[PDB]
Symmetry: C3
């Protein structure tokens, strides 16, 4: 199997795929919140689900959308950086720590966001998760630059 | 050519690149709608195109933005999952079916969204397209986990 | 090192990683603008930073969010297209030109957006940067199609 192309790759693929699934869960929650609160973004949706007055914004829906957007701002770059980083021959344990800190940080972020936890809990989880991404980005920069 | 690294890879790259182009088409449509409806997000844009009163929201522009955002929520994860999945040695026909269902589902989604088709047509196309993504994610999870 | 899998790869990884870092910079700027202008998206944030009246929208915050969103609409597809394109054996100089035009175009876009430069400066930078992406997408299409 090509999952063995590098020792850090299986850990990366586990963490990344869990995070993609976590984003799908946010999307599912968002749809459920729209139905429950009867808050739809499109008139065609609203007319199917009770009438035109239900084409409206809702704070809980908007919160779900913010969580999903923040995921796109952070998890998508990780998918790129973590994949490349896996092939740079990092210490396997060090790489696992990068991926684990990101995974735990991001799951905590979603819990803090959707669960409306007091500030600055969410902000701290965001910052914690960005640390390994910054670290990987710099390592990739040096490796890329040195092969120019 | 490295497109032959795995039998499913060419089909994946065809479907993915078509979907990226499809997203670019949505971006082009969005700009055209902004010009036609004179609905700009930035005061500097509005002042070039008729005056400050044209820095305003428009329902058709917002609809285009929702379609593009939903594309980012779904197509970007597919780019990751489909790429990895291509290297896991899936049955070539089975893989083609995963990629084809996603491609057709997503093109239908954009048509349903921008064409304002009655509910739940768009919702069904979204769900249809998510099915192969869920399938690929689970397969990657097992492969990654088993190589830990 | 696996950065040498193809002659264009180091240049791609340099430009891509710089762009990911550039997006992180936009995220940092966004947070700084929220604090400075006291404009928070969440009531829990606002209550930590002065009171509920600071859960409010701000034009500069919204501008930062638009820049970041446009980055997600354009840089993320480049991460995919540029990576694949690097392995298609393009002329090294031609590939460097694709990556450089995208990098310069996108950095200019962010400067034009956040710096509120007169129209159509931002629009032109967007269009300039999309050109190499369109070029790469078409090349990938042909390579993928021909290996079906
Ligand atoms: N419009 C809309 C809409 C808008 C916002 C959230 C949701 C949700 N969750 C929906 C939503 N409604 C339906 C639906 C309604 C009636 C009958 C069937 C369906 C249906 C069937 C499938 Cl297979 C998949 C999804 C849906 C579906 N999604
Ligand atoms: N501002 C703005 C804006 C805002 C929203 C949508 C659109 C569109 N579509 C625009 C928009 N205006 C121009 C433009 C205007 C006058 C002269 C030249 C241009 C121009 C030239 C090139 Cl090469 C590329 C793009 C544009 C362009 N885009
Ligand atoms: N809520 C919120 C919020 C909302 C919008 C922008 C920002 C910013 N920038 C913030 C924000 N506040 C804090 C913060 C506040 C008090 C004490 C500590 C912190 C803090 C600590 C770390 Cl390690 C990282 C981030 C933060 C942080 N971020
Ligand atoms: C991966 C998906 C994670 C979902 C996290 C669910 C967090 C919801 O948690 C809930 O939040 C409510 C406020 O929203 C509170 O009223 C509840 O006390 C709390 O249980
Ligand atoms: C406030 C400062 C936090 C910024 C995060 C920096 C992340 C550190 O990352 C480190 O960078 C070094 C130099 O590039 C490398 O030698 C290390 O391998 C890398 O882990
Ligand atoms: C990849 C891009 C797909 C573009 C799909 C275009 C769908 C537009 O379709 C149009 O929608 C209008 C409402 O918006 C209707 O008034 C028209 O009858 C219909 O033709
Ligand atoms: C409502 C239930 C729909 C959820 C979508 C699940 C997608 C099924 O996906 C399947 O999962 C199996 C176990 O992981 C694998 O053996 C199969 O290869 C895979 O196709
Ligand atoms: C990668 C991050 C790029 C940041 C670009 C910063 C551009 C800010 O530039 C500033 O913009 C202000 C309006 O916003 C103007 O008042 C100032 O004259 C100008 O210096
Ligand atoms: C307004 C027209 C601009 C559209 C951008 C097209 C980008 C051109 O891209 C070119 O496409 C050719 C055919 O696919 C290829 O042979 C070239 O390698 C490629 O650079
Ligand atoms: N787009 C972000 C940029 C900065 C950021 O990501 N901040 C973190 C820590 S405060 C966050 O959780 N933002 C909430 C959000 O993006 O909705 C924002 O508007 O806040
Ligand atoms: N962000 C999505 C999460 C769920 C989702 O993707 N739903 C599908 C099926 S109803 C959709 O097409 N959403 C419309 C959209 O994202 O604007 C939403 O707000 O609806
Ligand atoms: N989502 C974009 C689609 C088209 C686009 O990307 N346009 C460029 C050139 S005008 C841009 O900079 N858009 C500003 C933005 O996305 O906020 C939009 O709404 O404008």
């Amino acid at each position: 199997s090509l999952v063995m192309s590098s020792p850090a790759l299986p850990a990366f693929l586990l963490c990344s795929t869990l995070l993609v699934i976590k984003m799908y869960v946010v999307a599912i929650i968002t749809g459920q919140v729209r139905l429950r609160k009867k808050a739809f973004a499109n008139p065609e949706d609203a007319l199917r689900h009770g009438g035109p007055q239900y084409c409206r914004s809702d704070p809980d829906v908007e919160r779900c959308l913010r969580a999903h957007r923040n995921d796109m701002e952070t998890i998508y770059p990780f998918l790129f950086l973590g994949f490349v980083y896996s092939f740079l021959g990092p210490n396997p344990f060090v790489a696992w720590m990068h991926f684990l800190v990101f995974l735990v940080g991001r799951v905590a972020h979603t819990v803090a966001y959707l669960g409306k936890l007091r500030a600055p809990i969410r902000s701290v989880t965001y910052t914690l998760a960005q640390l390994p991404c910054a670290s990987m980005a710099l390592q990739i920069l040096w490796e890329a630059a040195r092969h120019l």
